[PDB]
C-alpha cells in the first residue's frame, strides 16, 4: 500500500511484533513492553518523517536469557534484520552473511520484503556452524502460534531428549515426526533431531503431552 495508506506500514509493524514474540519464544531476552510496541510508536521510532518505514532500522540483536543458557549452554547470540530491497539478491544475502561472520553471531534471521532468488537461497546455508533462518514479511504478519488449533510447543534439551528415549525404550525413529519446513518448526527454528514436547487439552483427560521429533 501507499505511504498514505499506512496499512502497509501496519502490516510491517505486525510482522515486527511477531518477530519480537518469536525471538522471545526462542529463549532470547525480549521484554513484554518491547513486544507490545504501539503502531504510532513504531512509526515514531522506525518510520521515516515522509511516512516511509525505515526497514533498515528494524534490525536488532537478541541475547539468550540466563535461563535459556542454563538449559541450552551452547545457545549463542541472534541477529535479526529485514531486507530493504523488495527482491533479495545474493549481493544483499552475502552482505547479511558477512555481518554474521564479522560479528560471529551463532544464528541470524533474514526477513524477505517481497521475494528471494535462488542465488541467495543457496548462500543461506554456507557458513557452518552458524545458521541462517529466513522468513517472509507477509508470512510474519500473523503469529500462527496464537491460533486456537496450535498447542504449546516446547523445545527439549538434549538431556530431556535422552531421558525421554530411555524411559520409553524408544529409538529416535519411533517418535512421532515433524517436518523441519513445518510453520511451527520454522517458528522454533528446529534442527534435525530435536524433540518437541507438545501439550494439548483433551476430552478424555485434562491435558496430554506428546513428543514429536524434527526431520
Amino acid at each position: 500500500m501507499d505511504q498514505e495508506n499506512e496499512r502497509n506500514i501496519s502490516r510491517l509493524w505486525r510482522a515486527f511484533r511477531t518477530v519480537k514474540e518469536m525471538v522471545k519464544d526462542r529463549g532470547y531476552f525480549i521484554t513484554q513492553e518491547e513486544v507490545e510496541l504501539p503502531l504510532e510508536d513504531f512509526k515514531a521510532k522506525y518510520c521515516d518523517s515522509m511516512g516511509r518505514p525505515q526497514r533498515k532500522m528494524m534490525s536488532f540483536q537478541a541475547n539468550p536469557t540466563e535461563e535459556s543458557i542454563s538449559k541450552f549452554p551452547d545457545m549463542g547470540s541472534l541477529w535479526v534484520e529485514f531486507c530493504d530491497e523488495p527482491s533479495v539478491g545474493v549481493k544483499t544475502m552475502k552482505t547479511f552473511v558477512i555481518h554474521i561472520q564479522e560479528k560471529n553471531f551463532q544464528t541470524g534471521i533474514f526477513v524477505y520484503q517481497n521475494n528471494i532468488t535462488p542465488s541467495a537461497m543457496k548462500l543461506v546455508p554456507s557458513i557452518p556452524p552458524a545458521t541462517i533462518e529466513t522468513f517472509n514479511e507477509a508470512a510474519l504478519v500473523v503469529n500462527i502460534t496464537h491460533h486456537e488449533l496450535v498447542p504449546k510447543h516446547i523445545r527439549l534439551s538434549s538431556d530431556e531428549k535422552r531421558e525421554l528415549l530411555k524411559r520409553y525404550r524408544l529409538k529416535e525413529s519411533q517418535l512421532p515426526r515433524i517436518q523441519r519446513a513445518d510453520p511451527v518448526a520454522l517458528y522454533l527454528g528446529l534442527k534435525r533431531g530435536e524433540v518437541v514436547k507438545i501439550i494439548r487439552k483433551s476430552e478424555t483427560s485434562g491435558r496430554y503431552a506428546s513428543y514429536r521429533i524434527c526431520m
Binding site: 505486525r14 494439548r200 514429536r212 526431520m215
Partner: protein
C-alpha cells in the same frame, strides 16, 4: 470478526468488501473499441468500457476507485478517463500511451495490443478482495459466553462464511480475529499453521462427518485414526500411496 465487532454488521459489511473477491469483469456490461465520450497519452482508439451501475452499487464500487486500480495495473502505459458516478452510462475510455510515436501524433495502434489490454483488463483487474474467495455469507451465529455472573449466556455474533479458501491472505485482513479462522482443507490448515493444527482440524472434520447424521462414535476411536494419519509430520492417506508407502513388513 474481531471480538469488539462481533455484533457490528456494518463492520461485517466492511470486511465482506475487504474479502469478497471482485474482478472488474463481474461489474461490467460490455466493451467496445471505436476509432458525444467526458478531462504521448493519446491514441485514436477509444476503448469503451460500460460498467454495470447496479452491480457497482451492490459492491460499493466507484469509478474513481476502479480507475485507481486500473492505473495501478496499467501504470502510464494506458491513458484512462472516467465518466462521473452520476452519469447514466458509467463509461471508462482508454487510449494507448506511446512516447515512442504518439508523443507527437495520433497514430493508430495495433488492435492486438488493445485485445491484450482487454484481457489484461477484463479478466485480471482484481478490484478488491482476497484471491480465490468468491461468495461471502454474512450471518449471525450463537455462542455461549461466560457472562459477568460466571454463568454461560448464549450470545450472537456475525460470522462471514466465505466460498473458497485462502488463509495466507485472509488471516491478515484488519478487523478479523486471526486465531478463530477455520477451514475445511487439511492441506491448507496444515501448511499455514502446522501438523498439530492439521491433525486437530482433521479430527474435527472426521467428527463432523459422523455427527452430521446424528450418530455417535467415541472420541477415542476417531482420535486414534487421525493420530496415525499424522505420525509422519504430514497427511498420510489410507491409499496405496499412503499406507503401502511405509517401512512396515513387506508381507503386510
Amino acid at each position: 470478526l474481531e471480538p469488539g465487532h462481533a455484533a457490528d454488521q456494518e463492520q461485517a459489511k466492511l470486511i465482506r468488501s475487504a474479502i469478497e473477491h471482485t474482478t472488474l469483469k463481474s461489474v461490467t456490461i460490455a466493451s467496445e473499441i471505436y476509432y458525444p465520450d467526458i478531462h504521448d497519452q493519446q491514441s485514436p482508439w477509444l476503448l469503451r468500457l460500460e460498467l454495470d451501475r447496479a452491480a457497482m452499487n451492490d459492491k460499493d464500487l466507484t469509478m474513481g476507485q476502479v480507475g485507481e486500480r486500473i492505473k495501478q495495473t496499467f501504470k502510464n502505459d494506458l491513458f484512462v478517463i472516467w465518466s462521473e458516478d452520476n452519469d447514466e452510462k458509467l463509461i471508462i475510455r482508454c487510449r494507448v500511451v506511446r512516447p515512442k510515436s504518439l508523443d507527437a501524433e495520433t497514430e493508430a495502434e495495433e488492435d492486438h495490443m488493445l485485445k491484450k489490454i482487454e484481457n489484461t483488463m477484463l479478466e485480471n483487474i482484481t478490484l478488491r478482495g482476497v484471491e480465490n474467495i468468491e461468495r461471502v455469507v454474512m450471518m449471525k451465529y450463537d455462542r455461549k459466553v461466560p457472562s459477568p455472573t460466571g454463568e454461560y449466556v448464549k450470545e450472537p455474533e456475525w460470522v462471514l462464511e466465505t466460498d473458497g479458501v485462502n488463509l495466507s491472505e485472509v488471516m491478515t485482513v484488519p478487523g478479523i480475529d486471526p486465531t478463530r479462522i477455520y477451514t475445511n482443507s487439511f492441506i491448507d490448515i496444515m501448511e499455514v499453521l502446522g501438523i498439530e493444527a492439521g491433525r486437530a482440524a482433521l479430527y474435527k472434520e472426521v467428527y463432523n462427518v459422523i455427527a452430521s447424521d446424528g450418530s455417535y462414535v467415541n472420541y477415542r476411536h476417531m482420535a486414534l485414526l487421525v493420530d496415525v494419519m499424522t505420525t509422519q509430520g504430514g497427511l498420510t492417506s489410507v491409499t496405496r500411496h499412503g499406507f503401502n508407502r511405509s517401512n512396515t513388513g513387506a508381507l503386510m
